[PDB]
């Protein structure tokens, strides 16, 4: 009966809508929900450090009344079985937030822990970032369903997979614009196409950056790590092809002049700074929502 | 009032230990009902060698007492390197209401405690692990009731921190403690004599034997621990062959009382000191035991702060 | 506008007095001010770790009702994977203040130029202005009014404590003397800024290699370690030049009979200061160490309400 959140499609379309609505309420009233008052603990474990993931989660948990126990990459599983660690953590904390690499490690922890496990960021998915992206799109553009989103650059990385899955879950027509060596994992693509039939969305994968941008409502990129990606740069030429009032997203950090140009990132279509803040609100909502169902 | 420290299990008298364990039971039922550190007031939690389960239990426990744990890993300069230990203790005493320290040699804890003007707690050391044994006693009481007169046997390395603390903390609770260990691996003589003298006051006893089967027979509680600490991996000994007859396995457990329970200071190395069947079977109390580090350490801190 | 505290003369004499008054009030009532209730966040960022800096700030923020997010060395150093400007914009969305221990002053200036929350220099190569606030609180509680006191600092005259004692000291009206050997003198820009500020407060600046003249008639004697970790490979013999400037019993006996002794910890007993001086009746190093908690909480309270 314990819900986990390891990939974007772990939420149904109706569940994802609940979490995003909660994120909006929490942005307006950040200390109104105190499910962890006590404080109750939440584990925030990094197999590899991520300062942005730490600020977001550590502050968010505290604003829910809890105390985050942050374990930096100075690992889980060397000492004892992941199953034994999961059993003990379940006695100390009400949720486990974990940044690890392979998906099989997250699945293993989730199969044994008796508290919710959240994928903070992994090799294959970045589902919390995409919740923050969807919150940012909704507050700038309103209804998500039927919007057109294009992601540019490395189509094999965790953002491309999560934009496909979380995007179609929200009714967004998602396009990935990527060069040949760097396309979405085929099982993720197939999961996105199936979910997309439930929401009226669709999946497109192309090497044509110009067609990806033409008519886009949301344009997204991410760092590249490098010649194959240059045609996919978000520059101002690409952005003129989009629909009026298009918004640009980029989970930070950005390498200005590589995947994105100053003019795009500092211009009026950029929503990168609101996007960064909304990681706090979206992750708090996810936690609140998981905790009440577990 | 004198400042009370908790560096070894016998730092509590039998009556004082009973007060702490009763408070641990109350705190398990009502975990935010005691707020002596409301403010927050600080508590230092220092690791000369990192321990992640010591971290979760103390960091959360201190927060639930209303306090704020300042957690210092060994990534900082080891205490005693950049400035004297006495200088550090004097400064710490201006910032925090208690000092929790995982360190190696017991003389370092003694030194800190002699100069600090706030309680010092041994979170785990080479010679003792008294906080773990408080959690063990809480767990035993939960399962069996009165501790006085129970029979507890520990198996494996008889000179490690858990053997020493089970001796001292166990006899302080009135438990008849047996250590089953091979020759060359027997309890420190000073700790054994201290346990024998304390056991006189409680009606307990101390037994040390190389006969694992005899130690298991009639026991109410069977305990083991890893055979080798990190610092012993390079000591030159074969640290498998001497201990294999002391494995806590189904055969050994079946020799004990039908109602016996099994304890183990985590992490366990399954297949070495304990088997999967025992670890995962119905006699195992290891998960409740791990949880009770939280409650027993909170009780200890509440009790020390009130007396200091 | 947003106020920052990057060096000691970022506070005017009147503003410094307000922060020091607040520090005394917070020492008496340490949880009575809750500007960060929520909790609101405060970033505490270390380009190079300092355990003493971390404890003081982490507890202080919590006692203001906030939650400190501590970033130790081990994260990618600010500037490596992203512009300081971009990091500052994102930080400003998460926290109500940025406390940063870094190296060159230009990095602090850059952060403060674009951050929309107060930026505090926790400790840097050029200045240690939070420690000097704690020193001034310590002197005030031991001596009363600061104006007109005579303070002499001994040792490396170009380190961050020498620079902040000059600037923070003259801001408080203290006559500051730096006693240091040739080649280890205060930065000229810092000395000139102190000399300008001293005209406003009736204070004065003296730089001298004459250790006995600097101790004579002093109300406060201060020293610091002769070498920072980043100076250990600079090629200099960093012991012989400084031995004449040791804060020892003979040097203390030249000062005013009611003189006090300060040293931001840790001390290397036997080098810059002796056991007899560290542990005798003139030493105020333990109160000084504690007051870093109260002075830093005061600064945060004051910056948060002005910004
Ligand atoms: C939410 O993330 C942050 O606030 C953040 C990002 C990058 C940084 O280098 C630092 I320090 C903080
Ligand atoms: C109470 O102890 C724990 O919850 C714990 C133990 C071991 C670990 O490796 C980790 I991550 C957490
Ligand atoms: C405020 O500074 C301290 O309290 C402190 C200083 C040095 C240390 O090694 C440790 I642990 C704490």
Residue numbers in the entry:
A (entry chain B): 1 to 74, 77 to 227, 239 to 307
B (entry chain A): 0 to 307
C (entry chain C): 1 to 307
Pull verbatim passages from the article behind this deposition.
The L-arginine biosynthesis pathway consists of eight enzymes that catalyse the conversion of L-glutamate to L-arginine, appears to be attractive target for anti-Tuberculosis (TB) drug discovery. The arginine biosynthesis pathway consists of eight different enzymes ([Fig fig1]) all considered to be essential for *M. tuberculosis* growth *in vitro*. In this work, the ligandability of four enzymes of the pathway ArgB, ArgC, ArgD and ArgF is explored using a fragment-based approach. In conclusion, using a fragment-based approach, we have discovered inhibitors that bind to novel sites in ArgB and ArgF and to the active sites of ArgC and ArgD, which in case of ArgB show on target activity against *M. tuberculosis*.
Soaking ArgF with fragment hits yielded eight crystals structures. All fragments occupied a site at the interface between two protomers of the ArgF trimer but not all sites are equally occupied by all fragments ([Fig fig4] and S2B-F). This site contacts directly with the α-helix 2 and sits between this helix and α-helix 3 of the opposing protomer. The site is formed by residues thr51, arg52, phe55 of α-helix 2, leu265, ala289, arg292 of protomer 1 and ile45, ser75, thr76, leu78, glu82, thr87, leu91 and tyr94 of protomer 2. These residues form a cavity that opens to the carbamoyl phosphate binding site. Binding of fragments at this site, slightly shifts the position of α-helix 2 by 1.9 Å, when compared to the carbamoyl phosphate structure, and also affects the conformation of arg52 which is involved in carbamoyl phosphate binding. Fragments were found to bind in two distinct sub sites across the main binding site and could be divided in three different groups based on their mode of binding. All fragments keep α-helix 2 in a position close to the apo structure or move further away from the position this helix occupies when carbamoyl phosphate is bound, albeit very slightly. In the case of ArgF, its close proximity to the active site shows potential to develop compounds that can anchor at the interfacial site and then extend towards the active site, thus inhibiting the enzyme. Nevertheless, while the ArgF active site is conserved, the interfacial site of ArgF contains several differences that raise the prospect of developing specific inhibitors for the *M. tuberculosis* enzyme.
